[PDB]
Scaffold this active site. Structure first.
Site, PDB file in Angstrom:
ATOM      1  CG  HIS A  73      -1.976  -1.053   1.203  1.00  0.00           C
ATOM      2  ND1 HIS A  73      -3.266  -0.890   0.758  1.00  0.00           N
ATOM      3  CD2 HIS A  73      -1.877  -2.335   1.625  1.00  0.00           C
ATOM      4  CE1 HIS A  73      -3.925  -2.025   0.896  1.00  0.00           C
ATOM      5  NE2 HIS A  73      -3.102  -2.922   1.424  1.00  0.00           N
ATOM      6  CE  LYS A  93      -6.035  13.867   0.169  1.00  0.00           C
ATOM      7  NZ  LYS A  93      -7.088  13.058  -0.480  1.00  0.00           N
ATOM      8  NE  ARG A  94      -4.621  10.446  10.127  1.00  0.00           N
ATOM      9  CZ  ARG A  94      -4.222   9.495  10.964  1.00  0.00           C
ATOM     10  NH1 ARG A  94      -4.928   8.382  11.077  1.00  0.00           N
ATOM     11  NH2 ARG A  94      -3.123   9.654  11.688  1.00  0.00           N
ATOM     12  CE  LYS A 148      -3.270  11.243   2.874  1.00  0.00           C
ATOM     13  NZ  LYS A 148      -3.723   9.961   2.226  1.00  0.00           N
ATOM     14  CB  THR A 207     -10.315   4.989  -1.539  1.00  0.00           C
ATOM     15  OG1 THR A 207      -9.785   5.282  -0.241  1.00  0.00           O
ATOM     16  CG2 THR A 207      -9.640   3.728  -2.088  1.00  0.00           C
ATOM     17  CE  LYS A 258     -13.800   6.706   0.532  1.00  0.00           C
ATOM     18  NZ  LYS A 258     -13.416   7.050   1.876  1.00  0.00           N
TER      19      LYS A 258
HETATM   20  C1  LIG Z   1      -4.242   3.824   6.531  1.00  0.00           C
HETATM   21  C2  LIG Z   1      -3.550   5.126   6.212  1.00  0.00           C
HETATM   22  O1  LIG Z   1      -3.855   6.107   6.885  1.00  0.00           O
HETATM   23  N1  LIG Z   1      -2.613   5.187   5.251  1.00  0.00           N
HETATM   24  N2  LIG Z   1      -2.482   4.651   4.158  1.00  0.00           N
HETATM   25  C3  LIG Z   1      -1.452   3.892   3.732  1.00  0.00           C
HETATM   26  O2  LIG Z   1      -0.438   3.707   4.399  1.00  0.00           O
HETATM   27  N3  LIG Z   1      -1.528   3.357   2.513  1.00  0.00           N
HETATM   28  C4  LIG Z   1      -2.686   3.871   1.893  1.00  0.00           C
HETATM   29  O3  LIG Z   1      -3.540   2.784   1.501  1.00  0.00           O
HETATM   30  C5  LIG Z   1      -4.695   3.186   0.740  1.00  0.00           C
HETATM   31  C6  LIG Z   1      -5.506   1.991   0.403  1.00  0.00           C
HETATM   32  O4  LIG Z   1      -4.751   1.106  -0.369  1.00  0.00           O
HETATM   33  C7  LIG Z   1      -4.204   3.826  -0.554  1.00  0.00           C
HETATM   34  O5  LIG Z   1      -5.269   4.190  -1.345  1.00  0.00           O
HETATM   35  C8  LIG Z   1      -3.449   5.085  -0.217  1.00  0.00           C
HETATM   36  O6  LIG Z   1      -3.121   5.724  -1.424  1.00  0.00           O
HETATM   37  C9  LIG Z   1      -2.198   4.690   0.674  1.00  0.00           C
HETATM   38  O7  LIG Z   1      -1.526   5.820   1.146  1.00  0.00           O
HETATM   39  C10 LIG Z   1      -3.276   4.634   3.064  1.00  0.00           C
HETATM   40  O8  LIG Z   1      -4.351   5.201   3.033  1.00  0.00           O
HETATM   41  C1  LIG Z   2     -12.118   7.107   2.162  1.00  0.00           C
HETATM   42  C2  LIG Z   2     -11.541   7.603   3.498  1.00  0.00           C
HETATM   43  C3  LIG Z   2     -10.211   7.847   3.628  1.00  0.00           C
HETATM   44  C4  LIG Z   2      -9.265   7.820   2.408  1.00  0.00           C
HETATM   45  O1  LIG Z   2      -9.090   9.152   1.886  1.00  0.00           O
HETATM   46  P1  LIG Z   2      -7.874   9.412   0.894  1.00  0.00           P
HETATM   47  O2  LIG Z   2      -8.219  10.715   0.347  1.00  0.00           O
HETATM   48  O3  LIG Z   2      -7.683   8.245  -0.014  1.00  0.00           O
HETATM   49  O4  LIG Z   2      -6.554   9.527   1.822  1.00  0.00           O
HETATM   50  C5  LIG Z   2      -9.734   8.295   4.820  1.00  0.00           C
HETATM   51  N1  LIG Z   2     -10.562   8.531   5.859  1.00  0.00           N
HETATM   52  C6  LIG Z   2     -11.862   8.320   5.738  1.00  0.00           C
HETATM   53  C7  LIG Z   2     -12.723   8.749   6.892  1.00  0.00           C
HETATM   54  C8  LIG Z   2     -12.363   7.845   4.550  1.00  0.00           C
HETATM   55  O5  LIG Z   2     -13.701   7.747   4.353  1.00  0.00           O
END
Ligand SMILES: CC(=O)NN1C(=O)N[C@@]2(O[C@H](CO)[C@@H](O)[C@H](O)[C@H]2O)C1=O
Ligand SMILES: *Cc1c(COP(=O)(O)O)cnc(C)c1O
Ligand SMILES: CC(=O)NN1C(=O)N[C@@]2(O[C@H](CO)[C@@H](O)[C@H](O)[C@H]2O)C1=O
Ligand SMILES: *Cc1c(COP(=O)(O)O)cnc(C)c1O
EC number: 2.4.1.1
Lengths: 830, 830
Positions: free
Chosen positions: A365, A556-557, A562, A664, A668
């Site tokens: 990931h 997003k986080r 980002k 993702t 959305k």
């Molecule tokens: C879980 C989290 O906060 N971080 N995080 C990762 O370390 N890998 C993450 O996985 C998601 C799902 O595969 C990817 O879409 C994202 O681009 C990647 O940064 C992602 O979201």
């Molecule tokens: C879908 C989702 C994420 C993923 O967002 P990204 O823009 O891919 O980092 C993170 N947090 C929540 C609450 C989500 O619904």
């Protein structure tokens, strides 16, 4: 009311009496003292009742037919609320709405009482949740296995503009969805030592922690299939955790039980960041050890635990079992499966390895180094001594394979080793996963290529057949039907309902791109969504916004990659231009930035402070008026996402090319009528490719440009020197324009930006604001904006997790999806 | 089948379907995988359903009518299992028996699966449980308030003859009886400091722990009244227990929550022993603080929280509230009630004190010094600073009362002070309770007199009106109908059923003392009981006994004052006499000794080892044969008591005169057809007085003899010198006759016996074995033994807790008991 199902005469009546049954018998309350929370539980229990019947026949079914089982191991499962989703998947929404209405209650008001199942950090965790829903919808005999943390991701509080973390006690009032299964408790070992005796090694003198499972039902979409998500809880044995005698204190011994039970207490709040703490490692082995025993027990029964060739031949293990590793977190499953097979079942190494490789698959990931799991050997050495030995042996044989394939290539050997030498020796869990799995996949086309070209190049050359790609997706159920019934309805009015489990059908919407009624409708729901969100804002958070402006949101986080900072620069720019020519017209915008920062991520917390700081200035400048508002969305989580996304106009996916594996949230937004401004990163590429670049706002460096720049060497001063607007912003930050009482407050940000920007924010600045100007232009033309929206929505089909799962199933698990309705839920009691 | 109620046609059918409902919907299981444990839960849930209706109307009732409320504060509630008891009190036993039978299950087998609610140590805790049942049966608006320990009294394991303690995880599989009430959570403060500002003191900078209540229903006997037992659980706030910022670690902060929650984790396993640990004190304030808030909230609503004089006049507080202190454990209720009234409600001291004294009552349960609660001032000083100040002030005013009453009596002043000077200053909680309560009572006539003549002499002279007596009792429901249905049936065959809630009616059995059929029956049930127990023994513990012998049993906590050692001496004596004249006839006996020893009580654990040691020798001597067996009953607890007592022939209540406050096990045996051999101690006096000394086996020193001996000075050597049989035993112990591998193993016991026997075991030896010979004589005459038994049973009526409660109610609480059936359970939904 909508196609939330039928509000049948017999069923609304049936619902109402069961709601009352539970209020009385289960909640032990009477209408005169019942509160909204009580009402919510009565309903939850009523709804839950409807799927236990299906849950039991589903599991019984798999026992009879005995198909290949899919085990999704992940340390995260970002579930969110489950009441509505359950109603939707069981076609109970309208009936419940009616019944509660007749009971004189507002279902929506009750739904807001449900606490979020925040057992995840962000992308990775939510993916697992969408996957589960898709696997159930596709009729796969799949099980989600994880850890039942009693404290999920912390709740974020903004105090004085700073983030404040506070424990997420999501179990405080109980969880009506889970079912504790203490009768299936299993033992998990830690520490101890290895004895090598006559016929095999023995893991001895270990500390035992018990794993108690809790099952949560996972209903497929309207197909009567209800799969199971099993979450393990740590429990202390009552013997040794008291019985290891000879002074200490009886009371103290009992209080110390909360030491073995700490294993499942809290989720680590990190994103794309690796923390090598012992507690983490313990959590990782805990879920792996318990899960595997469950897997093997199920296998031993199957149809082998009756007859078949007769002789526990694990040769068919891979034909009956498939375990997917969600990242390297559950990577110990590999050496653990070996341990069991070799040490306990007594299979020869080679036969055991063949079985292991054949049943395991690994999903990567991310590619940023700080996110990569490299565990210090001294840690594995103390906590899991036999697993270390097994790893060393795996490494030994793997390297021998390499040497034989690339004779004399001594540097390749060290590069590929599972063991990393240096300061402290470490184990590269990623290398482990590649070696012990028959398939390795990326989560987006570009990310998958990057793996082959870069990070895992040597491994790709060794075994090209292992590497695949599986672009992520999202569930149309939660991310469309649930959060945007308005949009789902109008789409259904034209093309039916079959698209909910066949999102590709959305393409048919292309033929309505010039339809005058549709354009008006699509535009109407979005306006309604914006009004509802604008309201919620004043309701729960308080201080107005304008629903006519462009809803510019980035949620997003919080991370440097980002680039919320890049978003910041643009916002300040808009501000400065307005202050320059006050009486010039500009398209109004409400830019909303939300996301959580890991507690130890200083920079990320500094950025949150910056965003609120900008809002302090911008939101109170009289000259700006209602043309520009900067709002920080507090405690961003799944339930909050279900609210903002449907109300968004512009989606921000601006990570530095090559850093966001997939994303993702971007998907959305696309399916919910928002336009995307972003870089050619992750799945953005495939999205623009699916909707056509003309219908997307792409800007900035591509991966190649980034590398070119790195060869050259990135110097932010250059950009600072040639762009006055950029210079002006940097000097505003530096001088305290945004932080009067503490003028040097943002020195770290500026310093970083100018001297150690790993994500070249400045390099994309010019092309970003230029591009932003193009979206403002298009927003001024409602009819064309909406038509472009229809082009995105109608073309998002490829991004449904059903598609992703169907691919995993066929290309990795070796199973065939099926949209066959399971034989009703109908009573039955054998 | 018996008078366990009616097995109605409609109700057995109704029961069965609800059993199935729960098995499916609640347990989520199907007949094909259900285990006895599952079946037990289905039934429990089915049964529980029947009393929620009554539970709700009962509480609603008290709200409407608004009677005076009785609050029983105790840190212990020894409940035991609750399935059967609930069936009995609701007249559901036969119907459930039938229904489960038809479902093809054995109810008795299922009942054995229920875990004991061991939230108590022994007498004190069980008393509270019997009281609750009686208060419900007498229709009192009473509430039991305590702490929900997640670990009750430890489970006792005998390893190598030694006691092994192991955590009692009674919640492991869940508790179907309790109902968590998170919505009524309350805050409790600790530490902090006191600020004296303008208009009053302020308790400031305190640490907050939350108290979450859990309600358990307490059904009256067949009267439709269901009262509530509220148990508090400690929970950490999610703010400060995370929010007190500035480095430490976010993870660590979350893990540290289990520090505030440790307060309710485990019950202290002590008997007639005081341990001054901080955790204990915390538990004590925790239950007091939370409970009082609940009490006042209820009062503020009443009919004052509507109108009345209008002005929160606490003058009526005592007319609406009564709080009983079960020993000094909840003694802080006094200064806490003052704190609230004075500090928060702002009443003047004097008005507050008048109210406090008028609502509080204290029950004393022992006279041995080591059991008396004397808390170090430095502890109260740190943990509850304002309460200390209040105590000092209470002391100040009380002493002034004394001085005025006894001018010049300076020694009396120091003797009566709540504050004890010396090594470390301490607070005498008992003195506190006397000063702040309007009534103080003993638990047996002699014990009550001893209080007035000795321990609280000065206080009695000051306020003679405060001191009363309330002889303990036991519930005929659990202790007769439940554990001995056989006996209850035959009694009912002759005199009806009304005696179950009117035990005095047992006197009518006197007229059957010469009845040939009755004598045969009474003798038959006891024989059946002995056979069943003898079976259970081999079933669950394994190694035969003879059901024809005399069942000599002593079951209670292991203590020096209880003199299990004296019992030991006799056993060894019997052994030595047999070895002397092998071929001489003696009445066979199975002597059973069971009880738990506090983990830190070295002597008590040494005695347990002695008993098993004697059994090792005696039970394997071929010459002894089946004439003498020594068995140690493992893990003695309520559920085990319900098994042995009905099967006992001889009850041992041999504590040194003046040490056992009352005892209640003695009453249990009397009502179940066992004869009593004991000393004139506790309630033994009243029992012999009720049955007639001719029908009792009394022996040994009376209280006066004990004191005479103390004046003289107790010298064990004398007895050793003049009794050869005694000398022989002591030299057997000393030489290793009972401990071959470790000859000096019992040196502590011998040493103690000879030099520091606080309970003059030797002084009662001669009269004890002599008396034992008289019971053996009488056992040889079955007809006369049984006739004496009938004299005890028929005369035990006075020892029912209904009588005790009726007295508390009238003479202390000021309320009138009522055997009026509450208006049915009938549906209703307002
Ligand atoms: C879980 C989290 O906060 N971080 N995080 C990762 O370390 N890998 C993450 O996985 C998601 C799902 O595969 C990817 O879409 C994202 O681009 C990647 O940064 C992602 O979201
Ligand atoms: C879908 C989702 C994420 C993923 O967002 P990204 O823009 O891919 O980092 C993170 N947090 C929540 C609450 C989500 O619904
Ligand atoms: C609870 C316990 O183990 N000990 N314990 C006491 O400290 N006091 C006790 O109280 C009970 C009930 O009043 C009395 O009958 C008993 O004689 C007394 O010792 C008692 O049993
Ligand atoms: C009744 C009871 C007691 C009290 O026994 P005594 O002989 O009064 O000390 C202690 N434990 C249990 C399990 C009881 O049932």
């Amino acid at each position: 009311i909508s196609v939330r199902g039928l509000a049948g005469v017999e069923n609304v009546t049936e619902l109402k009496k069961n709601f009352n049954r539970h209020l009385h018998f289960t909640l032990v309350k009477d209408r005169n003292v019942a509160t909204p929370r009580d009402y919510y539980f009565a309903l939850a229990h009523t709804v839950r009742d409807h799927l236990v019947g299906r849950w039991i026949r589903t599991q019984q079914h798999y026992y009879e037919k005995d198909p290949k089982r899919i085990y999704y191991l992940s340390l995260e499962f970002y579930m969110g609320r489950t009441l509505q989703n359950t109603m939707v998947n069981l076609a109970l929404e309208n009936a419940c709405d009616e019944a509660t209405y007749q009971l004189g209650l507002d279902m929506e008001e009750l739904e807001e009482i449900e606490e979020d199942a925040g057992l995840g950090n962000g992308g990775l965790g939510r993916l697992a949740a969408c996957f589960l829903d898709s696997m159930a919808t596709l009729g796969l005999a799949a099980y989600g296995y994880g850890i039942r943390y009693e404290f999920g991701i912390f709740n974020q509080k903004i105090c004085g503009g700073w983030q404040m973390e506070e424990a997420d006690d999501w179990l405080r009032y109980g969880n009506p969805w889970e079912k504790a299964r203490p009768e299936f408790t299993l033992p998990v070992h830690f520490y101890g030592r290895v004895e090598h005796t006559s016929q095999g090694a023995k893991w001895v003198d270990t500390q035992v922690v018990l794993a108690m499972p809790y099952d949560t039902p996972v209903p497929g979409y309207r197909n009567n299939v209800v799969n199971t998500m099993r979450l393990w809880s740590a429990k202390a044995p009552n013997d040794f955790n008291l019985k290891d005698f000879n002074v200490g204190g009886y009371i103290q011994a009992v209080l110390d039980r909360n030491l073995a039970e700490n294993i499942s207490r809290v989720l680590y709040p990190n994103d794309n960041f690796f923390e090598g703490k012992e507690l983490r490692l313990k959590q990782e082995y805990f879920v792996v050890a318990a899960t595997l025993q469950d897997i093997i027990r199920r296998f031993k029964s199957s149809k082998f635990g009756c007859r078949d060739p007769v002789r526990t031949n694990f040769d068919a293990f891979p034909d009956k079992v498939a375990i997917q590793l969600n990242d390297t977190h559950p990577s110990l499953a590999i050496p653990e499966l070996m341990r069991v097979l070799v040490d306990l079942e007594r299979l020869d190494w080679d036969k055991a390895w063949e079985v292991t490789v054949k049943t395991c698959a690994y999903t990567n990931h991310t590619v940023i180094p700080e996110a990569l799991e490299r565990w210090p050997v001294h840690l594995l050495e103390t906590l899991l001594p036999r697993h270390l030995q097994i790893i060393y042996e795996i490494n030994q044989r793997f390297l021998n394979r390499v040497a034989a394939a690339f004779p004399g290539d001594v540097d390749r050997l060290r590069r590929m080793s599972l063991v990393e030498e240096g300061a402290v020796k470490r184990i590269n869990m990623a290398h482990l996963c590649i070696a012990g799995s028959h398939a390795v996949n990326g989560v987006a086309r570009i990310h998958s290529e990057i793996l082959k070209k870069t990070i895992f190049k040597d491994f790709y050359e060794l075994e090209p057949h292992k590497f695949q790609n599986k672009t992520n997706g999202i569930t149309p159920r939660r991310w469309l039907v649930l959060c945007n019934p308005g949009l789902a309805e109008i789409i259904a009015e034209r093309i039916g309902e079959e698209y909910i489990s066949d999102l590709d059908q959305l393409r048919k919407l292309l033929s309505y791109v010039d339809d005058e009624a549709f354009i008006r409708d699509v535009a109407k729901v979005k306006q309604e969504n914006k009004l509802k969100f604008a309201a919620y804002l004043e309701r729960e958070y308080k201080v107005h916004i304008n629903p006519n402006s462009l809803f510019d949101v980035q949620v997003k986080r919080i991370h440097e990659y980002k680039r919320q900072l890049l978003n910041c620069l643009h916002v300040i720019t808009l501000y400065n231009r307005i202050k320059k020519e006050p009486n010039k017209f500009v398209v109004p915008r409400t830019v909303m930035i939300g996301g959580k920062a890991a507690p130890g991520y200083h920079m990320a917390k500094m950025i949150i402070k910056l965003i609120t700081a900008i809002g302090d200035v911008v939101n109170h400048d009289p000259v700006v008026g209602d043309r520009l508002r900067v709002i920080f969305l507090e405690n961003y989580r799944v339930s909050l996402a279900e609210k903002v996304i449907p109300a968004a106009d512009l989606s921000e996916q601006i990570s530095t090319a090559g850093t966001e594996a997939s994303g993702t949230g971007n998907m959305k937004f696309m399916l919910n009528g928002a336009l995307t401004i972003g870089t050619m990163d992750g799945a953005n590429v495939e999205m623009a490719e699916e909707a056509g670049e003309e219908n997307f706002f792409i800007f900035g460096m591509r991966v190649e440009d980034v590398d070119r720049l790195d060869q050259r060497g990135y110097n932010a001063q250059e950009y600072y020197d040639r762009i006055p607007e950029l210079r002006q912003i940097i000097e505003q930050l530096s001088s305290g324009f945004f932080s009067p009482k503490q003028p040097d407050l943002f020195k770290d940000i500026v310093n970083m930006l100018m001297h150690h920007d790993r994500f070249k924010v400045f390099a994309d600045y010019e092309e970003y604001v230029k591009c932003q100007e193009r979206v403002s232009a298009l927003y001024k033309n409602p009819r064309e904006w909406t038509r472009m929206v229809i082009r995105n929505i109608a073309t998002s089909g490829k991004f449904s997790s059903d598609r992703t799962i169907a691919q995993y199933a066929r290309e990795i698990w070796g199973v065939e999806p099926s949209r066959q309705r399971l034989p009703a839920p109908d009573e039955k009691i054998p």
